[PDB]
Design an enzyme around this catalytic site. Sequence first.
Site, PDB file in Angstrom:
ATOM      1  N   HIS A  73      46.279  39.550  39.222  1.00  0.00           N
ATOM      2  CA  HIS A  73      45.153  39.538  38.315  1.00  0.00           C
ATOM      3  C   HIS A  73      44.543  40.931  38.242  1.00  0.00           C
ATOM      4  O   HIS A  73      44.889  41.819  39.030  1.00  0.00           O
ATOM      5  CB  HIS A  73      44.103  38.525  38.816  1.00  0.00           C
ATOM      6  CG  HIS A  73      43.534  38.878  40.157  1.00  0.00           C
ATOM      7  ND1 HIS A  73      44.153  38.536  41.345  1.00  0.00           N
ATOM      8  CD2 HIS A  73      42.408  39.548  40.502  1.00  0.00           C
ATOM      9  CE1 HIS A  73      43.438  38.994  42.367  1.00  0.00           C
ATOM     10  NE2 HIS A  73      42.378  39.616  41.881  1.00  0.00           N
ATOM     11  N   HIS A  83      40.524  42.956  37.629  1.00  0.00           N
ATOM     12  CA  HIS A  83      39.071  42.935  37.432  1.00  0.00           C
ATOM     13  C   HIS A  83      38.735  44.079  36.476  1.00  0.00           C
ATOM     14  O   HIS A  83      39.197  45.225  36.700  1.00  0.00           O
ATOM     15  CB  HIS A  83      38.341  43.210  38.745  1.00  0.00           C
ATOM     16  CG  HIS A  83      38.815  42.357  39.866  1.00  0.00           C
ATOM     17  ND1 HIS A  83      38.777  40.976  39.808  1.00  0.00           N
ATOM     18  CD2 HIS A  83      39.384  42.670  41.051  1.00  0.00           C
ATOM     19  CE1 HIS A  83      39.267  40.480  40.928  1.00  0.00           C
ATOM     20  NE2 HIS A  83      39.639  41.481  41.698  1.00  0.00           N
ATOM     21  N   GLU A 139      37.995  47.135  43.753  1.00  0.00           N
ATOM     22  CA  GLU A 139      38.269  46.425  45.012  1.00  0.00           C
ATOM     23  C   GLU A 139      38.890  47.359  46.025  1.00  0.00           C
ATOM     24  O   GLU A 139      39.720  48.200  45.644  1.00  0.00           O
ATOM     25  CB  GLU A 139      39.223  45.265  44.773  1.00  0.00           C
ATOM     26  CG  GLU A 139      38.521  44.126  44.076  1.00  0.00           C
ATOM     27  CD  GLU A 139      39.183  42.818  44.348  1.00  0.00           C
ATOM     28  OE1 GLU A 139      40.428  42.777  44.255  1.00  0.00           O
ATOM     29  OE2 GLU A 139      38.440  41.834  44.594  1.00  0.00           O
ATOM     30  N   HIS A 176      46.927  43.406  40.698  1.00  0.00           N
ATOM     31  CA  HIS A 176      47.190  43.405  42.136  1.00  0.00           C
ATOM     32  C   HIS A 176      47.310  41.995  42.660  1.00  0.00           C
ATOM     33  O   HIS A 176      46.877  41.039  41.998  1.00  0.00           O
ATOM     34  CB  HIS A 176      46.093  44.146  42.951  1.00  0.00           C
ATOM     35  CG  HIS A 176      44.721  43.577  42.749  1.00  0.00           C
ATOM     36  ND1 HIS A 176      44.063  43.656  41.538  1.00  0.00           N
ATOM     37  CD2 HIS A 176      43.897  42.903  43.592  1.00  0.00           C
ATOM     38  CE1 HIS A 176      42.884  43.062  41.645  1.00  0.00           C
ATOM     39  NE2 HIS A 176      42.765  42.590  42.877  1.00  0.00           N
TER      40      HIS A 176
END
Lengths: 343, 344
Positions: free
Chosen positions: B64, B66, B71, B110
């Site tokens: 997915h 973001h 992150e 990732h």
Amino acid sequence: SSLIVEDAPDHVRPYVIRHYSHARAVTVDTQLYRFYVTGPSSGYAFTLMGTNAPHSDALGVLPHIHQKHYENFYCNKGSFQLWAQSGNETQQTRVLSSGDYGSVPRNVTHTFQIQDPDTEMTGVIVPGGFEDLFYYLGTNATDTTHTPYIPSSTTGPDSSTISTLQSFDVYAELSFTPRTDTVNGTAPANTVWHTGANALASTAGDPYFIANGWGPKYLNSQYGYQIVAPFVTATQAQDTNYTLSTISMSTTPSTVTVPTWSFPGACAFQVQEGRVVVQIGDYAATELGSGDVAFIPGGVEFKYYSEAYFSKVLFVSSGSDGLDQNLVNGGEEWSSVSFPADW
Amino acid sequence: SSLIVEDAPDHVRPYVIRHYSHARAVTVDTQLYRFYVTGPSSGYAFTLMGTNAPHSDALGVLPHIHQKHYENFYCNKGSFQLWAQSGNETQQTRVLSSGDYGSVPRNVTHTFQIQDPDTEMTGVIVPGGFEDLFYYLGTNATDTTHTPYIPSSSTTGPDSSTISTLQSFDVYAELSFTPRTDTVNGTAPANTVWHTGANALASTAGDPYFIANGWGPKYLNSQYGYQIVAPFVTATQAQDTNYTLSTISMSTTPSTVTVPTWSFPGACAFQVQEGRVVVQIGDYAATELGSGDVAFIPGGVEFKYYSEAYFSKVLFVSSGSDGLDQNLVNGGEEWSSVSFPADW
Ligand SMILES: *[C@@H]1O[C@H](CO)[C@@H](O[C@@H]2O[C@H](CO)[C@@H](O)[C@H](O)[C@H]2NC(C)=O)[C@H](O)[C@H]1NC(C)=O
Ligand SMILES: *[C@@H]1O[C@H](CO)[C@@H](O[C@@H]2O[C@H](CO)[C@@H](O)[C@H](O)[C@H]2NC(C)=O)[C@H](O)[C@H]1NC(C)=O
Ligand SMILES: O=c1c(O)c(-c2ccc(O)c(O)c2)oc2cc(O)cc(O)c12
Ligand SMILES: O=c1c(O)c(-c2ccc(O)c(O)c2)oc2cc(O)cc(O)c12
Ligand SMILES: *[C@@H]1O[C@H](CO)[C@@H](O)[C@H](O)[C@H]1NC(C)=O
Ligand SMILES: *[C@@H]1O[C@H](CO)[C@@H](O)[C@H](O)[C@H]1NC(C)=O
Ligand SMILES: *[C@@H]1O[C@H](CO)[C@@H](O)[C@H](O)[C@H]1NC(C)=O
Ligand SMILES: *[C@@H]1O[C@H](CO)[C@@H](O)[C@H](O)[C@H]1NC(C)=O
Ligand SMILES: *[C@@H]1O[C@H](CO)[C@@H](O)[C@H](O)[C@H]1NC(C)=O
Ligand SMILES: *[C@@H]1O[C@H](CO)[C@@H](O)[C@H](O)[C@H]1NC(C)=O
Ligand SMILES: *[C@@H]1O[C@H](CO)[C@@H](O)[C@H](O)[C@H]1NC(C)=O
Ligand SMILES: [Cu+2]
Ligand SMILES: [Cu+2]
């Protein structure tokens, strides 16, 4: 006087020595050795030493054997490759990272190589007094700031000199060629390293390796939860007469009395993770953190408990029925590194 | 009230939270998540969470992206594999073991997979508040005994239908991502450096990158005893997410050196990795932290810290471009060792 000491005492007594204390430090080229437990401090039961060293492209020592000492390699942090071979058995090698363990019985040819920049090896050698070798090979280090180590030929004695150390129970094996076909941290192929269970060697005299969390475990529920992961039992130690393991701990519930222990043989532990309070004999309770070592003489009463919600210690005991074995005998086989979520 | 808390506060204030405190625990299948710093507790500066999990033969999450969160993956103990790809670049993967670090900027695909039995990932996510996703998809966990994870092969977490539905949580499914399977010695593709040589931070924002323990750039600061900063995220990579991330390693403070007081524009926090670090925040008592314990200091609050152990290493995060790590770097010098000098 003080429970806490900066070097191992020159006689047997309760003590704690903090991680990276001076501990009669010596250097052997880039490697810095600290002797947290010595022959004199343990009444010759065992030696517990730490070695901190930077990456090296060369072996950390020429291949050799001990005829009278059982050697144990534990990786506190960073990583190092370990090679081992008994008699005409297949040569084994593993790259140990944090929490990994390598067992090197008497008469097993071995050597190691330091891989990562911040590598620390804890050596547990039985019987005690093996450190005299490093007093000879090493150069004393004041290391005023207590830095882990001081900021390509094989490290240590050269081929002439390593063949001259028989009086320290070191026998050269100059024809040994460490294997160079490692893949994913192991060789030969068809060994199990960080991919499956590792059993202790069932045959005395054979080397073996246990990857962090992949060995047999026992849950003891008698005094809170403790998980013992055996590294050395009577099966492997035989006449060297000791046990070695990690003990993982929950807190002690307030409805459980923290027990008082006493065993005939000396024992010691080094905290790997968490915060563990130890009260030994007549001394004040003291809380240990990462890399701190507690030493308890045979016949001295002691209590310990975890202040952290989870702590893990590396534990060694002289005798066949020290604390770890007692907890195993009073516990059950267990398949997790974590204890139950309910009391 | 008291400095030490069992769950992160619901408003910004100084606090300490011990490793494996309840910390609004949830499980997602076998994984246990703990939220040591939250959006509300940090005034939305960052989230600092810990995930403990056993070995899994399957991915820990479907792949997915973001769009609005950066992150950061840090391996406290054990090991996990991390895969990442940005835009048109080659897909990268590394197996992280203790002290290793993986950076996953916004818009980078990732996923991860847990390898070893006693694995702990610390995630630092910027800005704060992303944890709602784990409340939502997770199951509340009481965990009375504070065990690291609950003792106990489809991909862990939401199925492909569910993960395509989570845009409100800043999760965007990348179902056509195929994690590469040609890992050897913990890395792919073969032409990469992992535990074999120096790692650099990405040259610009947007690209993932990995730093193996001890192999990134380091700076020695000698003003207050010895401290070694190993940057993981600087202004170059953070850009508008406006934070820094590093480890700080520390000697003891010599008796002739006054332990400094710090007061920064932005919130900061650290989690101890090794050693014993005393923090004295605001008017609270000096408190000693051990492995995995977390201290949080709001922007504008004075604090002092020092190492009681002879060597400590903490994972450090700060909101702003001029937090503690960058201050120590700017006052220090390039340094090529994870150890500090033997003499003062
Ligand atoms: C994986 O890592 C190992 C090191 O653990 C590499 O093995 C080396 O291979 C070279 C070239 O064949 C030898 O000269 C070295 O002696 C080997 N080292 C050891 C300790 O075995 C191996 O090359 C790596 N594999 C890949 C594909 O990168
Ligand atoms: C070294 O370890 C890697 C995993 O890190 C192994 O990679 C797997 O290989 C199998 C068979 O080729 C694939 O089906 C898996 O998908 C691979 N996993 C990953 C994560 O890439 C590799 O086979 C190991 N090498 C050897 C020779 O044992
Ligand atoms: O014989 C030796 C030996 O065993 C070890 C050793 C080192 C670290 C450990 O943790 C351990 O258990 C053993 O190092 C050595 C280093 C030398 O320069 C010479 C030696 O002869 C040895
Ligand atoms: O989006 C997700 C995500 O980012 C991470 C994650 C986990 C650990 C970390 O340390 C970290 O930085 C991120 O896990 C997830 C797990 C799910 O089941 C579903 C998700 O959508 C995510
Ligand atoms: C080790 O080898 C020596 C020399 O061959 C031998 O005398 C000794 O009995 C062996 N010891 C053990 C414990 O196997
Ligand atoms: C090294 O330290 C030991 C232990 O204190 C001491 O006996 C020895 O003399 C020292 N060596 C030198 C050369 O000073
Ligand atoms: C083993 O060690 C224990 C404790 O030190 C001691 O009581 C015992 O005599 C030893 N046993 C043997 C077989 O030497
Ligand atoms: C991320 O991708 C989205 C959708 O393409 C784009 O609108 C957004 O600006 C990107 N953000 C960054 C920081 O690259
Ligand atoms: C990546 O490649 C595509 C064509 O395959 C192109 O449209 C896109 O602009 C490229 N990305 C960048 C940032 O240049
Ligand atoms: C909370 O968790 C339990 C299991 O721990 C679950 O059965 C329950 O449905 C969850 N939610 C509520 C409302 O209790
Ligand atoms: C960056 O963060 C700092 C500290 O919180 C804040 O003071 C500053 O306004 C921020 N800068 C921008 C442009 O967001
Ligand atoms: Cu040896
Ligand atoms: Cu994500």
